[PDB]
Ligand binder design. Structure first.
Ligand SMILES: [Mn+2]
Ligand SMILES: [Mn+2]
Lengths: 348, 348
């Protein structure tokens, strides 16, 4: 598709690089640092390159009205969920060091101004902005002024609303990625609309394109890689029997490994051009292509025609099936045996 | 992508229909009708809709030169392989009835004029033309005059060489499909070039598009579905420990089931548009979007500014984050408490 790219630390991202899978532990640790470490361990052992957290500072993230609104995948207020799962600054700093001590990249999604400022102090290599904040222009202006690349999910937002955020990002001069997304825990296959990735790349040609996903399996993400996706995102848990509203659509070590393997295979198979010559096909072309042969015993002097000529494998004959009709009208320079390949010396 | 379509018997094929998986037993039965039936049974029990055979009449398919050429995946001449695996007319008729007795569709790839005529007598619902015969124009003219839809693989052929075959097909007035393909047993991921499907659809807008595959797994085909493929083809065997040159890249009942499941999921997830409104996202939009709030206690009379205003979740406030800046300059109609959502009655 394109040659756009940028780096998250020492990791290059873009169409011409290996797709990057972001393992979002998010709020899956339910506020326990111990659980968070067990999930970081599972990600590390599964071969993850990036672990993504969610930075929640409830007071700066939402007003009192949030204590009265229930999310689609929960039974209590969003305020109660975030307050229950939120890690204080101290613990989050410990989580970042822990992930890095494992040789992995740590990034986190900020949901507020205070969160963004905390992450800037921690000096993360890139900032993720969720679909909920894709239209929070003032917050995006703040994050872009940090000087690091931005990864923006675009669920729940139209191309036009997104253009305002991208304009702000360009103005700041930092590279960015746009992840197509559908924000429903979980998301049915029918609502995915992988075509959205194309719409985004067409509208924003300088953007790295990817997919953030909330379906129950790897199919959507694998399709995203086939279409040209460079960044894949799925919630991640060490085991499926963990409690939590996001566990339902989370991938686990086993499913992460499958996704990584499939993404690699599709990275290799995607794109390319129809007319490209594949050397490995040579031996097949040599025996599978047809050559012109006598379909009847032809006496010297007789004229060749579509009545006494036909075509058969292999393709080493003097005349290819492509020249079949050009032999019509020619005269046999000698007797031609039925079934024999017509050779140049066979025509006067 | 498009609304092109046609029927293979009572089965509709096209972008707006469920992708069709063709199970190619081909020469996997090694010339044994008993083995062929065991493979047909395995396909049936796995849920296959179509079983594809290969019709070999060695004398009309190749000249004596073929007894001296070895294919890439074999150690003996192509003539010896075909002669060893070929089913006579009697047995092939029995195979067709057997497949149909199982409620499945039977089609077969012809490799010669004699093969095409035999299949016409059997009256198959559609004709498959392999990549080896994609450039065999005289043979294609013969098959097109039969009046049934044609499925043409295009491996080893450039867009220009393919246009000659398509012209012949249109001239005959029958619907057709173009399958991208790479003819190497097996095919590495890197040689797949899924982009070839796009090239084909762009060049031939009236063609149903699909993929014929020879890789070691389902990844290539799943990627093809994500891109818009309507027909998938893989060699098929009842078990992987069967002898034969094509068994290496064949799928088996278990892998067929996985492909069918994935193709279904990707049929649902592919395409669509970014701007489409997903009803299921409503509850998320209501709590995730931000509203304007007082960032400072504002005394009546004071002017609102980016210094004493900010934005926070949820999205039920009188002023959305989109209107943040429009409040700059307004005058507080009364005292505004820090953290409170700015309401219409809050400004004079
Ligand atoms: Mn998510
Ligand atoms: Mn094949």
């Amino acid at each position: 598709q394109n040659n756009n790219e940028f780096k998250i630390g020492n990791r290059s991202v873009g169409y011409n690089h290996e797709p990057l899978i972001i393992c979002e532990i998010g709020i899956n640790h339910e506020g326990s640092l111990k659980t968070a470490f067990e999930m970081v361990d599972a990600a590390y052992n599964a071969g993850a390159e990036v672990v993504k957290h969610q930075t929640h500072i409830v007071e700066d993230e939402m007003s009192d009205e949030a204590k009265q609104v229930i999310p689609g995948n929960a039974d209590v207020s969003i305020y109660e969920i975030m307050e229950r799962c939120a890690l204080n600054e101290e613990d989050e700093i410990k989580l970042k060091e822990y992930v890095e001590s494992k040789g992995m990249i740590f990034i986190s999604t900020p949901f507020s101004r205070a969160a963004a400022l905390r992450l800037q102090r921690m000096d993360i290599p890139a900032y993720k902005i969720g679909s909920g904040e894709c239209n929070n222009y003032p917050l995006i202006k703040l994050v872009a002024s940090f000087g690091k690349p931005i990864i923006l999910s675009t669920g729940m937002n139209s191309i036009e609303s997104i253009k305002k955020s991208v304009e702000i990002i360009r103005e700041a001069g930092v590279p960015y990625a746009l992840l197509h997304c559908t924000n429903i825990y979980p998301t049915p296959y029918e609502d995915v609309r992988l075509g959205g990735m194309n719409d985004l790349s067409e509208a924003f040609p300088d953007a790295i394109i990817g997919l953030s996903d909330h379906t129950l399996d790897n199919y959507a993400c694998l399709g995203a890689v086939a279409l040209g996706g460079s960044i894949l995102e799925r919630h991640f848990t060490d085991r499926m029997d963990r409690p939590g509203p996001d566990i339902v659509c989370s991938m686990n070590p086993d499913t992460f490994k499958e996704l990584k393997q499939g993404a690699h295979a599709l990275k290799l198979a995607r794109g390319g051009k129809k007319d490209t010559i594949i050397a490995g096909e040579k031996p097949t072309k040599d025996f599978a292509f047809a050559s012109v042969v006598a379909d009847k015993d032809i006496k010297k002097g007789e004229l060749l025609s579509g009545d006494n000529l036909w075509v058969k494998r292999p393709g080493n004959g003097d005349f290819s099936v492509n020249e079949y009709e050009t032999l019509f009208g020619k005269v046999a320079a000698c007797n031609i045996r039925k079934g024999a390949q017509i050779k140049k010396t066979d025509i006067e």
